[PDB]
């Protein structure tokens, strides 16, 4: 069925590549590449909320 | 009152007295007045002090805890989720509730109890050379002073400097 008026699917994947590990990616279509990646500062007690409080 | 005295034979509270916890009244011609008793009263402190820390520590404070999210072939593994976070939260619910209950019933028996406990530390000190007038009164067999009033509270009052003259006042009765 179009959903926001599209036939078509697309499936968003992630991975955490480690310190020193290589990812490789190969393809004849279908790829929609990776353009900007995020390196990771790991904290702790940190967490999502759902709120409508203002800031 | 578990333990008679308050609430009981000795039936009310003195707004008058605003020293301490427990304390006496006193009546010399000099005048009258009031006098909270330190040792008991800073005891009773203390006690009830440490007990309120001594609760407030078994609490350890609750650190970071934000809910799972989970999707919708993942029914089972979100109701255990919820199942342990209700499961705990009763129990937390059930202890804290159920703890000031029962710790309530204990503190008011400990001022009871203190105070019990005082009267009689003064009853076994007189004896003789007063009479029980009834809530928590006693009436001296002989003159005493407001110096003399300080022998009482202080804990060291004179059975014997008192013992003849009240003999002779206590046996005309
Ligand atoms: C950012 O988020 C907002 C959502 O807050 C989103 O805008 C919203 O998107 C939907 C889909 O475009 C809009 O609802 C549509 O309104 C139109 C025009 O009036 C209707 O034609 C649509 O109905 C058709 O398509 C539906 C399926 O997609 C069918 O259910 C329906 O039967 C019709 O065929 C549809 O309801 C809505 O108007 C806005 N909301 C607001 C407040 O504007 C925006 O698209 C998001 N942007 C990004 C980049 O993701």
Same mark, same amino acid.
């Given at each position: 069925?179009?959903?926001?008026?599209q $036939?078509?699917?697309?499936?968003?994947?992630?991975?955490?590549?480690?310190?020193?590990?290589?990812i *490789?990616f190969? #393809?004849?279509?279908?790829?929609? $590449?990776?353009?900007?990646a995020?390196?990771?500062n790991?904290?702790?007690?940190?967490?999502?909320? *759902?709120?409508? #409080?203002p800031? | 009152?578990?333990?008679?005295?308050?609430?009981?034979?000795i039936?009310?509270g003195?707004?008058?007295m605003?020293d301490?916890?427990?304390?006496?009244?006193?009546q010399?011609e000099?005048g009258?007045?009031?006098?909270?008793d330190?040792?008991?009263?800073?005891?009773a402190?203390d006690?009830?002090?440490?007990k309120?820390?001594?609760v407030?520590?078994?609490?350890?404070?609750?650190?970071?805890?934000?809910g799972?999210?989970?999707?919708?072939?993942?029914?089972?593994?979100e109701?255990?989720?919820?199942?342990?976070?209700?499961?705990?939260?009763?129990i937390?619910?059930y202890?804290?509730?159920?703890?000031?209950?029962?710790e309530?019933?204990?503190?008011?028996?400990?001022?009871?109890?203190?105070?019990?406990?005082?009267?009689?530390?003064?009853?076994?000190?007189?004896?003789?050379?007063?009479?029980?007038?009834?809530?928590?009164?006693?009436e001296f067999?002989?003159?005493?002073?407001?110096?003399?009033?300080?022998?009482?509270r202080?804990?060291?009052?004179?059975?014997?400097?008192?013992?003849?003259?009240?003999?002779?006042?206590r046996?005309?009765?």
């Amino acid at each position: 069925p179009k959903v926001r008026d599209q $036939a078509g699917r697309m499936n968003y994947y992630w991975t955490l590549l480690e310190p020193g590990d290589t990812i *490789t990616f190969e #393809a004849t279509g279908n790829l929609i $590449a990776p353009w900007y990646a995020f390196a990771l500062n790991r904290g702790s007690g940190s967490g999502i909320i *759902t709120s409508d #409080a203002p800031v | 009152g578990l333990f008679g005295a308050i609430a009981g034979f000795i039936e009310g509270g003195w707004t008058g007295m605003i020293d301490g916890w427990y304390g006496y009244h006193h009546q010399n011609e000099q005048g009258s007045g009031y006098a909270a008793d330190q040792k008991s009263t800073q005891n009773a402190i203390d006690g009830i002090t440490n007990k309120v820390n001594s609760v407030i520590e078994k609490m350890n404070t609750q650190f970071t805890a934000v809910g799972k999210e989970f999707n919708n072939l993942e029914r089972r593994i979100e109701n255990l989720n919820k199942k342990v976070d209700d499961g705990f939260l009763d129990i937390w619910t059930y202890n804290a509730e159920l703890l000031v209950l029962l710790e309530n019933e204990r503190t008011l028996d400990f001022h009871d109890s203190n105070v019990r406990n005082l009267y009689e530390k003064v009853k076994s000190q007189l004896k003789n050379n007063a009479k029980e007038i009834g809530n928590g009164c006693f009436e001296f067999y002989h003159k005493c002073d407001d110096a003399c009033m300080e022998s009482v509270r202080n804990g060291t009052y004179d059975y014997p400097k008192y013992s003849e003259e009240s003999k002779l006042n206590r046996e005309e009765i």
